[PDB]
Design a protein around this ligand. Structure first.
Ligand SMILES: Cc1ccc2oc(C#Cc3cccs3)c([C@@H](C(=O)O)C(C)C)c2c1
Ligand SMILES: Cc1ccc2oc(C#Cc3cccs3)c([C@@H](C(=O)O)C(C)C)c2c1
Lengths: 133, 133
């Protein structure tokens, strides 16, 4: 559906990368964070940009953050357990020597992930096509 | 056109709020920053999320940041001078007592700005409709 996202944690250079995948398109947003506060904020910003209706996670961590819960309540996000990111670290590796900070290489890699084609449609075209329909 | 943005600086509680408006839709992204580094990063993240082709500013500040220029070069953004945000501070004022940090109230206000209708279409529906067409 248009508003189903999967949320996960990956790691590089001792830092946490928050990764939201729009399931039907493969579209991603990611951010390097230092906590629940950061995830709540990331979710609130993602919800003002796109239709975010259900967020899937793989474990119980996000069900225990009183601050994730308030962000979800505010923005009208349902959390669901049991989801309906090596590529991401692949493209970070392709670009890492183009940027001084990890966070910059992440955003360069999101850019490439979302803009490239698999002829055909990019994840960026795909999420907009799904939301238009 | 689908990729024309206007970029501006507003201020509240001694902090700088970076505001990108998609011109044809009224869609906004904003972020509280402490510099050119922050604007470059904000622009790179905005360009991986949407078609960003031309960014208009009102003064000369952004034409002097060697780091804005490299972000623009990387992502394929043209800077243009001479643009082709009280509402934003209105909705921050409506919500400010709902959040501890300014940055949270900003994102709450972006959420409302982008999701509300003027019957009719929200700025969020409008930017997706323009990009689909
Ligand atoms: C090409 C390009 C595009 C966008 C970019 O955004 C940032 C940034 C930033 C930060 C904000 C707050 C703490 S770090 C950069 C840096 C980098 O390469 O890491 C810059 C020092 C050259 C960057 C380079
Ligand atoms: C309802 C709701 C939604 C999303 C939210 O995201 C954040 C955050 C954060 C930060 C990350 C890094 C430095 S501060 C909050 C806070 C707030 O109200 O200011 C929280 C202390 C309650 C918040 C509240």
């Amino acid at each position: 559906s248009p508003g189903i996202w999967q949320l996960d944690c990956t790691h590089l250079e001792g830092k946490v990368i928050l990764v939201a995948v729009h399931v039907a398109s493969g579209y991603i947003e990611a951010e390097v964070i230092p906590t629940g506060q950061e995830t709540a904020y990331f979710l609130l910003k993602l919800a003002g940009r796109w239709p975010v209706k259900t967020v899937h996670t793989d474990n119980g961590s996000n069900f225990t953050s009183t601050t994730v819960k308030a962000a979800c309540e505010w923005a009208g996000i349902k959390q669901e357990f049991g989801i309906p990111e090596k590529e991401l670290k692949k493209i970070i590796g392709q670009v890492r020597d183009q940027a001084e900070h990890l966070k910059t290489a992440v955003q360069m890699a999101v850019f490439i992930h979302n803009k490239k084609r698999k002829g055909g449609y990019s994840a960026g075209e795909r999420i907009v096509d799904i939301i238009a329909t």
